Design a protein around this ligand. Sequence first.
Ligand SMILES: [Zn+2]
Ligand SMILES: [Zn+2]
Ligand SMILES: [Zn+2]
Lengths: 82, 266, 65, 131, 46
Amino acid sequence: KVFIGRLPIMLRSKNCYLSEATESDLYKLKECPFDMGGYFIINGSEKVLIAQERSAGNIVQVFKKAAPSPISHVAEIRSALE
Amino acid sequence: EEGPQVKIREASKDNVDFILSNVDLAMANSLRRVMIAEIPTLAIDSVEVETNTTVLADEFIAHRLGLIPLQSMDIEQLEYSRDCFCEDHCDKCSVVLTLQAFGESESTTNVYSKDLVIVSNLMGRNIGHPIIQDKEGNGVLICKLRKGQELKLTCVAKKGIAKEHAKWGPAAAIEFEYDPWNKLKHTDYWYEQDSAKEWPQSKNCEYEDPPNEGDPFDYKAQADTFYMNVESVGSIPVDQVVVRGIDTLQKKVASILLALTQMDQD
Amino acid sequence: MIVPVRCFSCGKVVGDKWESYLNLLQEDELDEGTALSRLGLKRYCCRRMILTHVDLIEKFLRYNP
Amino acid sequence: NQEDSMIMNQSSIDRGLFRSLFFRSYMDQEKKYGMSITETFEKPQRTRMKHGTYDKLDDDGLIAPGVRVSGEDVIIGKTTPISSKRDASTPLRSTENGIVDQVLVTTNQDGLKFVKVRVRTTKIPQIGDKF
Amino acid sequence: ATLKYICAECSSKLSLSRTDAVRCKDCGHRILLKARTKRLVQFEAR
Ligand SMILES: [Zn+2]
Ligand SMILES: [Zn+2]
Ligand SMILES: [Zn+2]
């Protein structure tokens, strides 16, 4: 019912024409059959989003403190609303 | 007959196995090189492209056109444009070929070296003919094209030699061996247990008497008798790639006498 | 990407042999090793040339104008 | 071929061993001003210019696709209006050089003149080259 | 006799001058190439 912005699409993904396309379909589209998609195409250039690694959340872990420290050990839990 | 002798073993249209005997290694070798590097040939060396819509780029194609072998029997009677007095070139120094292809067939149209069309006057002489040894007689698949793909070129074959570019070489590979039973000790085989068992024996071992322990090391032994095999791309008949080689090298040796001469003047 | 005319190494013509070789495989149902020897490609410098070519030109052609 | 460098067969390089193609694509558009002030693609003169041959330039301010370009020849003629003719061309990379391979003219969402030129070069293996 | 531009898909010699849009005679496909030069080019055959 209402339009709110444009969502850049990832090639070879469901919402991308190339998904269902095949061999001949592609050549006729000019896209290379061997392409593997997985990237975006913002303002002309092919953009790749790089996986960002990090520590899983909501988990309990204990670590010992340094010799100089009023604290001996500690139990940490990083709580995040999934 | 006189000095260094020959004894052609097998021999065909493309190769000439033979035994050069009673020659100096120096010479056997020089000849080998000369046959590869300096024998004159004719090859495409200028491609004026008018139209091309193939998948290959102009210079990609132009490149190939150069390696495509061409007739060079009477190359000895064509001039290096660099010596001919025309501004640029003529029939006295070049051969002009033409290439025109269009994809009429709905199925990949093939451009072959048989589609080259001489245009300049050959002044009657074996020269500039796309050498074909192909079974179907098409020789060298220049390139392929689809629907309405066109290719209109013009070539200008000129006289040349390997040193300038390989495309001008007529030899292409040359077998060369000597002293199959390391009697001269010109090598020192590597091995694990037994040199003999591990290192294959050569076909040429036969045509030469085996060693036989007892005997001391014959150091006086020099080295003649070379088992060579000159293969040819075609531009020139195998026998020629040998005689012409023998000749070219000779003229070279000559020019030095000649040079020492004009240098006599003062 | 079209058969190379002549082998880089020794320069022996090889531009012609493409189609012949592709047959000795498909039709005459032979094995590369022999198909090559059949076409007169002796030493590996000439062998490796044909045996290894990747005729990309074909996927190229398959495009359009 | 000492200390990590190699000797390479020339005859091989000739018969094409290791040759390669190299394409580069320059690009440009015509600026638009809310108060209708636009640039242009044409082959200017007199009337702030470049230094390279504008000649290879057609009247659309482009080079035809078979043209051999080099030095700093202009591959795209363009001008900016402000108060008449201040240049906005695009010379080929001062060091590079080749053959214009494919030009193309399209618009861009806000309907402006969009163009991309593409020079192609063949690079043959030479001494300083890496492998 | 001559031409100038072309349509990427429906390869059809087209052309025009300033403010003539940038579309094609049929294919909207607003791309358009610039077909070869008439000045023939020459090459070193090496
Ligand atoms: Zn002349
Ligand atoms: Zn070879
Ligand atoms: Zn159209």
